[PDB]
Design a binder for this molecule. Structure first.
Ligand SMILES: [Mg+2]
Ligand SMILES: [Mg+2]
Ligand SMILES: [Mg+2]
Length: 175
């Protein structure tokens, strides 16, 4: 939790000619993210790329999570495209965050497109992914597609929970 001290040592090591590496940057970017200090995490991320330190999936996940949380979806999507271009493979956490963020932003057609894509890449969606999409479809009156996803999740052995059922029961009832 002691971020201002960690940052002090970080500055100290650079001043002593000890070169930070991907672990150093990751730890700090994560800590900064969790501390609300997203802009500072992003500055460290820029810096690590200038120094030739290559970010990894943990780096991208942390920033995308932070940006998604903050509603900064255009920038979260920029990082997502960048990570795929660098051949850093996104994982279920990356997609969940984006589909959730695009969810909350009511950009539902884009969330469904990412959902399609994650399945093409072999990333297995989880109950959170399905719940977000089914909720979004449910609220838009797109009941038939919500029911297809509900059927799909059961078929894949993802077990629905009470919010999944509520959403659908609500739709069938008031629609
Ligand atoms: Mg920036
Ligand atoms: Mg940029
Ligand atoms: Mg770019």
């Amino acid at each position: 939790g002691r971020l201002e001290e960690a940052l002090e040592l970080f500055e100290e090591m650079k001043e002593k000619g000890i070169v930070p590496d991907v672990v150093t940057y990751t730890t700090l970017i994560s800590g900064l993210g969790k501390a609300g200090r997203l802009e500072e995490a992003l500055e460290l991320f820029e810096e690590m790329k200038e120094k030739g330190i290559v970010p990894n999936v943990v780096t991208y996940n942390t920033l995308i999570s932070g940006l998604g949380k903050a509603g900064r979806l255009e920038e979260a999507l920029e990082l997502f495209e960048e990570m795929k271009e660098k051949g850093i493979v996104p994982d279920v956490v990356t997609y969940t965050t984006l589909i959730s963020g695009l969810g909350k932003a009511g950009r539902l057609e884009e969330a469904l497109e990412l959902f399609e894509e994650m399945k093409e890449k072999g990333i297995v969606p989880n109950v959170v992914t399905y719940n977000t999409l089914i909720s979004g479809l449910g609220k838009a009156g797109r009941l038939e597609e919500a029911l297809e996803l509900f059927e799909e999740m059961k078929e894949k052995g993802i077990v629905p929970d009470v919010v999944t059922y509520t959403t659908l029961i609500s739709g069938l009832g008031k629609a």
